[PDB]
Amino acid sequence: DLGRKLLEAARAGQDDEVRILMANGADVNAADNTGTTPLHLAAYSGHLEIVEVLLKHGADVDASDVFGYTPLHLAAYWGHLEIVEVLLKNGADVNAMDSDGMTPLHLAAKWGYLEIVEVLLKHGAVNAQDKFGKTAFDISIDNGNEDLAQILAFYEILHLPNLNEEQRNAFIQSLKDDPSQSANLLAEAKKLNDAQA
């Protein structure tokens, strides 16, 4: 049973066993009844090289399990920066949502992965609300993570349509003087954004 062997080797990080299983015609996109594929297990376990091989042989980069998790979800949840970069480089939907409406940005913000949040925003990650109506910034505020709230408020302020350059740079400079106030400045910015619309 080559599919099961490929799933086991993908989860255990056995690179040469994955190569040999591929050489015998194992299905790159073999999924168990939960919808979990070898790319899922390699992105979850943190095996970058197996991610690169699987993607090289045609692994579905946007395969979702019965919970709605894509491999990008798993890489963001478990803090695998380089696997996030590799999956995005191979066309992963940066805005994929799970059963709870959560994007990889939500899961990366949940654990305070600053670099993964940066990489996701570089690839055009969108600000979305989960089932609880919460954004990645809200998650940043529920936790005591000042840096993450500062970055996410930087991006929210950066993308407001009705602020002019002097106001936007004033809010950004106000995000570098005291980051503890990142939650208040964004609200001030949003009020101004809606007064000039």
Numbering used by the authors: 13 to 209
How do the authors describe this structure?
Here, we propose a method for generating proteins and protein complexes with complicated shapes using fusions of alpha helices. To design amino acid sequences that can stabilize the alpha helical structure of the fusion sites, we superimposed one or two turns of terminal alpha helices of connecting proteins using a molecular graphics program. Then, the amino acid residues important for forming a fused helical structure were chosen from the two natural sequences in the superimposed region. Our method does not require complicated computer calculations for the design process and can be used for the assembly of artificial protein complexes with predictable and rigid structures.
The second example we chose was a fusion of an artificial ankyrin protein (designed ankyrin repeat protein (DARPin)) and the protein A domain3. The DARPin protein, mbp3-16, had been previously selected by ribosome display from a large library of mutant ankyrin repeat proteins as a protein that binds to maltose-binding protein (MBP). The crystal structure shows that the two helices were fused into a long continuous helix with nearly ideal helical geometry Figure 2 Fusions of DARPin-protein A, PKA_RIIα-protein A and PKA_RIIα-DHR14 by the shared helix method. (a) Crystal structure of the DARPin-protein A fusion protein. In comparison, the fusion proteins PKA_RIIα-protein A, MrsD-protein A and DARPin-protein A ligated by the shared helix method have negligible structural flexibility at the fusion sites.
